[model samples]
Target: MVLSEGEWQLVLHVWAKVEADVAGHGQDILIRLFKSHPETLEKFDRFKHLKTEAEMKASEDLKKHGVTVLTALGAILKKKGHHEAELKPLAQSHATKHKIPIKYLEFISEAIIHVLHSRHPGDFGADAQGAMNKALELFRKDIAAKYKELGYQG
Candidate 1:
């Protein structure tokens, strides 16, 4: 599960492009998350009523929650090490308080890729996607494993 120095650079470099607009991209990811997995909509009162991308995009509640998701992720991506530690609070909340299925963690990453690919098609090519994919996979899966470590069942 180790990422090379080169791999980390690719992720952060691509991330730099959208870091200026975290809210925009974060909410985009959230919209895709709910639309792509409608069952998940019920998990958030704030976003549960959102039935379409436009509706979700217009939601302040969804926007705030998106901030929370990406703020943590953005913080972690900017770091060179200690990702699991960075994800502790995020994993803990879903594991204990939120009671979200650990498997849901990976879906967020997929949504991220979906947004990034469309938003920056020219630069976010295969290599960047591959590197970003590895990083997200590492973060999301470790977050889920940490959920298990905290005694949260699948």
Candidate 2:
């Protein structure tokens, strides 16, 4: 699962942006999102509203955690295609546990990508596009397999 030099750099760039964004203005965005979709109030907690130096430090901690998850997930995705067989149950359960509609997953993914794109234009380039294409390919494979496994006729 070796990403191209450009793809690797793009992932790293996005990782840095996530760190900075979460440590800085991420709470505001979260609040805005929750305001629009208040049903997610339980998925998060007080941490969503924090804005102190300590909170910022914790943000760094969580950012590292997130990066680790993404790194592991990225490797799996790069190797095993979209691994959709593993994602569908998680998606369904996430929506169920949060008592939100399943469609929110797509909404959130799109929103996060959009947020990253808008927030950091100069940092992205052709590498990002290539990396994204690779990701999408893997995602497509996973989703197709997962849906079939789950008995989805469509």
Candidate 3:
């Protein structure tokens, strides 16, 4: 899916802010996941004990990984939706080492879009929303495919 130049610019613009506040926005995304799907918390050893936002905020490791996540996402989007280079290794590691459910991996795309829309409010119009959705969906597809190829049944 090709984004119009305007759409690309818009996505990159908002992404710039997300990148700047990785700990903040990234925490928001993760908190949303924990809130919506508490089972996902079990996947993270550091976060498993984080029962509230206050506790999550106090965890240095959580903040560090939160930044790491945003950095990885920035790299994926930097190629304009072509994310196999990043997604492949990530999928393999998570599937093999972490044994994380592919469904939770897929949930990341939804969490990202939700955080973006909620953070920027009216700024993310239909075009930008569509562009980001398509881009993130592509990323999710790559992750899912690679996860399965790496021998993950889920």
Candidate 4:
């Protein structure tokens, strides 16, 4: 779904808050991912052995990696449509090199929505939710399409 200007505004506002606490917010996203799809943890060598929430809670490296992922996404947002040649290098790496399935990227959208609702409560109303969902869908779609173009057979 193409986001309207107003939706973009709402998404940016929410993203600003998410960016403010990258460590906490990012870690929350990763935790949500692991909880929702345990197999995803197997992709990360550092977290492959981690099974419980307490284990994830104790892993500082997970927290750092989460922040790194979010930070890369932020750059993608900022450089949207501006950079040519390699528009989504991070996404490409995850999709092609790392072989992270597109579904996991989609999960990040759901995780972000969950975080927004849980962290902001009343602030994350329908408008906020819809806008963020559209924005994230667009991002994920773009990345996945690019991955295919880069010779991803899957």
Candidate 5:
């Protein structure tokens, strides 16, 4: 609700640039997160045991998992104007069932923005970054609200 239709379109337009090789971009995001926070990799069950960078590079499920998450992201973006209809229950599960860290959410957002900005130096300019930031802020706020509902205090 904070963004205008034009802003939303700007967000989507930048996202469209990502769909061409989403799976690759997905891996890039994960790698960025892992490199930035090596401890974060342990939270994922499939990637729990790899201690070195080589093991991380050799995993088959890395790309597999990236595809899973980015595929979900794809639909969520398509449903953006629906006003959290798709994201509400997702955040609820992340807060109540999965008990995910709010910090992790922000990390993912940062990695995604990092990958997008890096991949499209010419396109992901100030306006697109602004729109994406507002969108991610809404996403983070909704999840934080869900956590508040559960008394997570995060």
Candidate 6:
């Protein structure tokens, strides 16, 4: 996973965000983002505050299992093997649930990256930064592959 300097900067900014203690930060960013892109709001329950106690508690279950989805994601990126097959179902299913243009995924991705870089610096580091850029690349590929599988241009 070699990265250009600019890419490395982006990576540090993003991975640092998910690990930070910014309660509802993701939500706040998303709200403003969706306001700018109102078409995207129709897709998810943006009004409902998805950060409910139950959902947070459910994440604790994932944490206790040691499955560590975030760490597992880093492994996936390091492999550089865009497991498209796994994403096909995910994209298709989520598309319907969200009622959003599939392209909003890209919009959301950029918004998320922007928010992370703008908001968090303490947790950003070289390795994590590079790791996040790779992860996002893989994530985008995964979305595109699934969109293609479902007969969408994506």
Measured by TM-score, the strongest candidate is 1
Evaluate model 3: give its lDDT.
0.80
The segments of candidate 5 whose C-alpha lies over 4 angstroms from its true place after superposition are: 52-54
TM-score of 4: 0.89
Q: 2 or 4: which has the higher lDDT?
A: 4
- How do the residues 43-123 of candidate 6 rate in per-residue lDDT, one tens digit apiece? 434233334434433443323322232444334443445445545555786555543454675666566555665666555
Candidates ranked by lDDT, best first? 1, 3, 5, 4, 6, 2
Question: Can you tell me which runs of candidate 2 are displaced by over 4 Å?
Answer: 1-5, 21-92, 95-102, 125-130, 133-148, 151-154
Quote each prediction's TM-score: 0.91, 0.45, 0.89, 0.89, 0.87, 0.54
Error of 4 at 87 (Å): 3.8
Q: After superposition, how far is residue 26 of candidate 6 from its true place, in Å?
A: 1.7
* Model 4 C-alpha lDDT per residue in residues 27-54, reported as the tens digit of each score: 8889998999888888898778887888
Structure candidate 5, residue pairs in collision: none
What's the CA RMSD for each of the models? Answer: 1.5, 6.6, 1.7, 2.0, 1.9, 6.9
Q: Against the correct fold, how does model 5 do in TM-score?
A: 0.87
Clash count in backbone of candidate 5? 0
Q: Which lDDT tens digits does candidate 1 get at residues 1-154?
A: 6678988888888788777888898888888888788888899976688887788888999998888788788889877567757778877788788898755777777899889999999988898899888887777677778877888885
Displacement of the residue 105 alpha carbon in candidate 5, Å: 0.9
Cα lDDT tens digits for candidate 3, 81-150: 6666777887777778988776786677778889989988778777778888877767767777887776
Residue 52 CA error for candidate 6 (Å)?
20
- How good is model 3 by TM-score? 0.89
TM-score of 1: 0.91
Instruction: Give the distance in Å from residue 71's predicted Cα in candidate 3 to where it truly belongs.
Output: 0.7
- The true-versus-predicted C-alpha distance at residue 134 of model 3, in Å, is 1.0
> Model-by-model lDDT, in order?
0.82, 0.49, 0.80, 0.78, 0.79, 0.52
Off by over 4 Å in 3: 1-5
Cα lDDT tens digits for candidate 2, 1-154: 3456657567656756666545333543343344555554445554455445455345654445345434444444444333555567644443335333334444344444555566777765557755754564445445444545655422
